[PDB]
DNA sequence: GCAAGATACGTACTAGTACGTATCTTGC
DNA sequence: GCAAGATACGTACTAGTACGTATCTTGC
């Protein structure tokens, strides 16, 4: 068990380094200094900065805390989005998801062998799973393209987050994520599921409080 | 005036290829073919260059054919921009300018990524108010938050497009984004009038090249 | 590809200002802002530069809006070209290219002034045959001699315009030249259809800038 | 009288130099060597290369031999044009008119103080005089712009000549000058004066023969 | 684990060499690019020379092949046409691009790289294929497989050089297909020649199958 | 002052070539070229302004002042002779140092630092090879609609590689054999009937053409 | 005849100086430009210095004036606004442009040009005008014509310098009119101030009349 | 390694300025700057890459590190003090060698050879002068719709000339008198009532401001 | 407190230029 | 045959670079 704890001490250190200076500018020593583990300690778990970065990308979907199982399936999606918004904002929520976001958004190069496809594909299928469930519980309009909507939400979320970083340091992210869902859902969500959805910041906070405890 | 454009174009292409922090003046010099001396007249630092390319995407990006249906103009703008980003030598400025704005970097690099975004946002809002007054969108829609939503929404659709299929699907992805965002604020029987078609998309590309 | 255009433009402006024989590579370097090295990739001699700018006035000069009345197209071409020559930064290539062709120099400078003229002549002839087949000019008109007459006629009208009122009157002088040459070969009731007006002249200027 | 002959020996030498290398490239020594006169011989008549060039421009209208006084005034214009065409072609006709043409067509610079306006203004008024006479002898249509036609002919002649130099070394100039007049005259010349005009090369040669003798 | 870190370094080395060439490259460049530790590097490779020699020793060894073919000459043709795609784009295989630069660049005898070793292996690999095709009855009776193998290896490398110089490798596929189209009439059995597929559209299909 | 200008210019060119061939473009210095040429600094800088200019000028001398082959009966033999002659010229410890330097300058890569035009010697090579094939087409020794342009790109292309591989394997020792191989295998795909057996691929001939063209 | 050849040389000298400045200029440049003989040149001027000094000694002397005015301050204003046009275009007067460069450029005391001489004359010329306007009752009682003349000469030269640097003399006319608009309220009699015409359209009309 | 970098950089800048002021841009050499600065070649080239870069950097130091005037009661007096202070600074056998070099570099012309940006020091001069006038407008010491921008171009413009003429006539000896003249005559055209008599145009003050700002 | 690195300064070259002298060309 | 000039070569610098060592910074 002393191996699985020290690997996470490495991964968080790498992600922390990657968040602040990007994949390019970061060195293996940067990650080594932050983690405060030995050269050989590192070498057991990760062979290279690439292998490090790929792993922090790989644990982006599994990293996000899952909310208590909601009765309305679209509300789960709404709550998850506003949780992720609160997680990125205050920071102290999660350290991996920040650097893993920056690793995915950063353009980089084909010469660096990062696979930004993995955290983005797996994120889309997860969003598709919820929308596929919500359809089985009859929450979405009869002829909606569940696949195109997953891609759209996964896209739009990334960019609403990008803008919110630039303009306000993510201070308004809650309001903007809420805005995205408040405007996107009238197109595919059943009317009446629309009146039943809880957009308020007061509710979304009471999910951030509950996820920690 | 002549060399500054040649420099800025070359700067954008280098910034697109390696990103701000990896890039050097040296690389921009070599890619521009201007003399050492010709560059320093205009730009002393790499920081000065990047800032200049960012403030350039305002007036470098080609304007759209004016229309009475202001939402179709807004739809054209984003579809044109979807093709500009796809190209390579369609516009070298926008591609580098995007990568400069989207990429995070550091506060240590003093680049103001806010002002291209400030411009992008103010422009889409100005067009939506010109759609509001002409009775195209619901009477009391939050125009400021909508434009902020459109800028943000596009940015991510673009990023997601870039990673997944080297920007190739961006035309369709922006079409979906506009189709799905519109019913939340468009007035009745306006969505049906709007032209989302790919063969119109490549047709507005011709009228912009001046 | 990028620098070659920047070089050629700068070469044309220097050639316009001082003429071929007075000009040096040194002057073109300084006016272009490209490195010594960047120029030699493309051009070893001053002769090589001039020849390149001459062969450029073929494809650099912007094309005219296609019309069913082929003589109106021919009239537009020469009126557009009358405004291109008047400017300064409208097109720097044509102005230098003209001065290079018109000026006499020497046989010692190996410049082939024939091939821009060969191009200019063949182009106006090709348009006149497209007017002949569409029944716009008298059935058996000497098309080869007419185009040669039009190229020659323009060249002098231009020179005379340049000397007398710094090219300012060229629009009117080319209008007169077309008005007076037309009845000798135009079919009945075609001269009356043709639009010579100055406010059309400035209007075709917009559609050419691409 | 030994002064007026030696001044023309200078002027022809200058014009000859100016024809072959233009105003710019030519030196005062170039003119001095060709003329074979002394430094002081030159200085009496001309102070500078500019003063030289201006003088050769100034004697362009007076230089052209005037044809025997024709009955048809437009035929005089036609014959004069085809004479000038023959004069430039064979060369041996006149040495001044070649260099004086090149001095006028060459763009030069505002920094050189040549006045290319003089040979061109005086050439236009002369063409206007003929067209003004032809009107008094009723050879031109009732509402023709005599001033615009002088400018047009003076222009078009310069450029028909320019093209003919580039393409054929002026070999076809006769045919091209003829062509210009054959196409320009239907617009302003009276019909019937048009049938009375002699365009043939055989006639125009018999003016070149006669002008020498 | 150790083959993992070796590969990471080799790929980075191959990139730097393809970028700046042997002389201009530093070991310092290769370190920053691999993203391994100083210690990790100096265990597998001591000097710049050893790095270069290793990438060279992997040219044939790490070249992605094809689906096994009925015609071993079409196997040969598809491999070559694949290499033309594998050399052009920003994504190919860095090992190939790297060693191709290392082999073709002259340098000097002052540097101690063995350029003959990748060349020998690539010639032998080509020969082996032509030998395999002789027993399967594809090539004609009195053919010199050695001399033909040397021809192909040589011809390809220069077809590839001209292409880089003139079109930045753009026309490489058309140049290679051209090469194989004129050379094979000399040694292929007629009946193989008409059953051969040089087509550009087939070249895309072998490239799409190479996403594996 | 023409004659002596040509003489010193050639000393510089031969010296530059030798330097380029032994260290390449980037490693070479003007310093190196001065030492070997024997010329003064101002003498060289009168003729060539930069290392690039020097290097370009040797690539120019690959085209011009390349030993002329005799006017042959068959245009293809004239092409075969030209290829095997160059093979001899790249081989020997002198032959031409200019052809050796040029090939190295053409085949090496160099950084995006340099502005050396490698397209130019290759274009002239291809245009000359095309011209020989087009003359062979009118004589009817090649197929009447064979792609004369695509073949020239093929020959220039392949030869360049045949040479490079030969340099690596045998220091260009076996070059002429390899070039003969190249031609023996490529010609049948576009040569007319009868024409192929008439050609003389022998090292017995390739050397007679060599010593004749040396004079 | 001799004043003819002197002028020809001086104008050419003034051009070269305006183009390359004093130090860069050669006498060789001035010869080729004047188009006179070596002998003709060396009779009037021996050295580059003597050439430069002569153009400088002609700054006021060869400056085209105006039609005589009712208001001597509007005479002053029109002259200054004329100079702004006479300095901008490719055609002005080369003597002005030349000497203005010669005066404003620093050089060194190592060269022996007297920059004070054109400056003295231009200051005296300005003073004389203001003195002429005092007796005609245009300027106010307790005004220092000397100090004002020095101000104007100084102010103009720098207004002219800034204009060259920022707009390549494009805005010089607007800058000079601006200068005269703010300075004159200090010394002009009110009643002259409202009768004064700074207008750009009038500036064109004085320039059109200067075609003589 | 910041502190010592600033120290050597300033030695180079002061030395460059001195050189530029005495021979101008074109005549000056890197050689000259090395000799006077005392610095090694590699030391200078670490900080400045070309003569242009040097010359630009001294024009940059005209703006920054120009002696600050005290926060005055009247914004126009603060402008009057700034002008007369610079007049003292251009005058004295030291004062600042940087302001002297900068002025010469700005006012000279140079060939189309050089790529020195003279617009930049002038723009900063004009923008600072405009800022002072705009603050004077809010305080209501100037006319409420006076063209604050056109005045800044006027002051920078005229001062530059007042100085140039002063250099020629009296080696800048009478500069402060001339500058006082300039201000006494220009201010009434845009100053509010009362404001003008409150201003202190005296050389009695201009020197008190000088020694205070020197410390 | 110190290992990594960033930064600052130093040395030894090579590249580039300005201007000087020599030597051929050429048009009478 | 030779004066003007164009051209070729020479000398003495200054500019620019590559790579070396020293010295500070900084994040644990």
Residue numbers in the entry:
A (entry chain D), D (entry chain D): 6 to 218
B (entry chain H), C (entry chain H): 9 to 218
E (entry chain E), G (entry chain E): 7 to 218
F (entry chain A), H (entry chain A): 4 to 218
Share the article's original sentences.
We also present structures of AvaR1, in isolation (2.4 Å resolution), in complex with avenolide (2.0 Å resolution), and bound to a synthetic DNA oligonucleotide (3.09 Å resolution) derived from its natural binding site. The overall structure is reminiscent of that of other TetR-family transcriptional repressors, and consists of an obligate homodimer. Each monomer is entirely helical and consists of a DNA-binding domain (DBD; composed of α helices 1–4), and a ligand-binding domain (LBD; consisting of α helices 5–13). The dimer interface is formed via interactions between the two LBDs and is formed mainly through hydrophobic packing interactions.
In order to gain further insights into the mechanism of hormone-mediated de-repression, we also determined the structure of AvaR1 bound to a synthetic oligonucleotide derived from the autoregulator responsive element (ARE) sequence. DNase foot-printing analysis had previously established the identity of the ARE located upstream of the aco gene, but this response element is pseudopalindromic. Crystallization efforts with the symmetric AvaR1 homodimer yielded crystals that did not diffract beyond 8 Å, presumably as a result of the asymmetry of the ARE operator. Efforts using an artificial palindromic sequence derived by inverting and repeating each half of the pseudo palindrome yielded crystals that diffracted to 3.09 Å resolution, and the structure was determined by molecular replacement. As a result of the use of this symmetric DNA, each homodimer in the crystallographic asymmetric unit is bound to a monomer from an adjacent ARE. The structure shows that each DBD interacts with one half of the palindrome of the DNA duplex. Numerous contacts are formed between helix α1 of the DBD and the duplex, including Arg5, which inserts into the major groove and interacts with Thy7, as well as between Lys43 and Ade15 of the ARE. Additional non-specific interactions include those between Thr10, Thr42, and Tyr47 and the backbone phosphate of the duplex. A comparison of the ligand-binding sites with that in the hormone-bound structure reveals that the binding pocket is further occluded through movements of Trp127 and the loop harboring Gln64, consistent with the roles of these residues in effecting conformational movements of the DBD upon binding of the hormone.
